[PDB]
Symmetry: C3
Subunit: 257 residues, 3 copies
Amino acid sequence: MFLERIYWEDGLRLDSDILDKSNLSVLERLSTASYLPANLNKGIVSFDLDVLILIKDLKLYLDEKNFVFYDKSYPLSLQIMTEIPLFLNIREKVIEKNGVKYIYNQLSLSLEHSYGFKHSIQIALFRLDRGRLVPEIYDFPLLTLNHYYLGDIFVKLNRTVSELKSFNRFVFSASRSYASILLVFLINKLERELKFAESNRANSSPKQIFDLIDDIYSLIQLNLDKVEELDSIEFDFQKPLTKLNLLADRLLTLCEY
Amino acid sequence: MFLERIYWEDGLRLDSDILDKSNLSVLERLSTASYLPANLNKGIVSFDLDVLILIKDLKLYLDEKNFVFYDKSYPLSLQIMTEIPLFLNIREKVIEKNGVKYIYNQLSLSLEHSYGFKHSIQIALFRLDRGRLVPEIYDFPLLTLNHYYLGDIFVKLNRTVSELKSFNRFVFSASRSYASILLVFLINKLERELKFAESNRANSSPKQIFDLIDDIYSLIQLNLDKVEELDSIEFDFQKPLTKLNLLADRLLTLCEY
Amino acid sequence: MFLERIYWEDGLRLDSDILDKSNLSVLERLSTASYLPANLNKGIVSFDLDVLILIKDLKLYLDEKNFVFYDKSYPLSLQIMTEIPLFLNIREKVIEKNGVKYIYNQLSLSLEHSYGFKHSIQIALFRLDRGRLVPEIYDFPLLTLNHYYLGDIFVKLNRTVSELKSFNRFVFSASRSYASILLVFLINKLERELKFAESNRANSSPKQIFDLIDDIYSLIQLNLDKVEELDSIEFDFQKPLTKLNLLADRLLTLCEY
């Protein structure tokens, strides 16, 4: 049910309930009318942690375009002790500032899902071996590229670029000299995009990188002279990191020859 | 005139009129400040109908960034009887929910323009032959790709891809072997983009598809060895479906040879 | 500190201060939740001047996503008399419309920074020689392409396209016939993009043009047979015009041979 705005013209004794309802309706209406890139309903715009789990930057969109922002006023840590899911808890509370009451949102971390909270959504997956807490991939859309898992992806992509250069130099150029120029062209394009993306994390998206890698993969398959059936992977806005990892692994497997 | 926010500091007897005016001003200000992709003022984000005209999904932005959403609470049909324009009517009405009055927007369908309504904008064009109601192209910007007319476009594009493959295999490769590799590359790129777009309708735009088709067209014209004058068509954000149809028709005409 | 919404449930004598605070908090919350392309915090969406400095169109986002709009109700001129910085001043004032008080934002132009104003941000740089006021490049992000400085950039880009065609026709094609096809392809792509961008200014961004020019530059460097070290320039969302000018100048310098 889409309620538009509240109806004031009737006239009634101004109580707190009607004002709170009006504010809530206005907020809901304007949040619904808002737009996100690629018409997404939720995503992560920034999420970084210290490398005990300590949160430095947290900014994301929950389901139905709910905005969550983390103030640096209080620490956000869990400090586990001994497949470990990580959950985010949002509880509202009343605080007073310079003589005026307000409504605040308090963030917390828990090991499992909890009740009695406004929101409880899993945001990360962690696996520990001898107390190391190796990060793990979790399926969630992200809008920007400044995610804590992107370091491993960048290292793997640099290794893939080096492997691609070696593969083109050694055997691919000798067999098919015609497509070698286009392959070098696309490799340089990917390298330039990676160099730009590493320096600027908040102004990039995974779709461009996935498109470049997929294009490089398809170009090799077309002239590979192997079986005519080519395996195609489609990008998914729900699991982008998984698709990037699978594409990189397949590219490395084909490049190792 | 850009009114920013209302001025409360004067102090006055709190009547319903001032509260309604404040809410309206806040809504107008925040709607004006909003942003849409490619800096558009209106567009269609989702519009699907059953295949009597029955509406299943309706979501679009009117002029001056006005947001219209269709609740599935009530049916939305016209049921014509015997170039048939279709119009959308918006009338506001007062409803009460759990003891609180609200303002609701009611949607309706009419054969022609009507007065006495908040909005009356034509959204579709229909032509019937022996009571069939064949869909017709209407000029209106759309943000996503889930429009009811995209099925015919997808079928035509698949046929165009097959025709392009046949044309490249038969005559184009034999005459110009140099550009054949690039042509096959671009054809595969278009095929991959089409495969992704068909599965994911809400996360795609017509501009990418138009760019790919136009690029394929230009590549053929450059090495076609025919008259040096090449006909170039520019994408228009006001009539995207028309441009797509014209480009596809021209590509098919050139491919039939 | 992220204050969410105001707390009304306590109940208190309804004064103007609490209503103004509630409106301000709602506006701040919804402005913070808003999103801009490439996750930018500020930018210019439209800025045109008559060619005394007379402002015709002014629309931009200030820092922290503050929206500024210029009404055509009053003139906006400076009329200097004799490195001249230009500043924008925003002062709020109370106006009354049809019996209802409101809050208005008044825009002004000044030679230097001023105090006692809500905002004072430099937006343009001008240099005069014998009273001519030649426009100068200032570093500021812009979202669309309808900026007053784009005319010179478009002229330089057309000259660059002509120079690139001449360079490819004369010497580059004779030495390396393999990459000539790809170079002509990319030149035609850039020409088509420029033709589209000139007609449609409000629906384009500098990133696409920069990517096309950089791609053309890299393709030439790869097969240039000169020193293997290639100079790469990265696009910056903070100084896009500067990067475009530097890339165009370097391309012209390399093309002159």
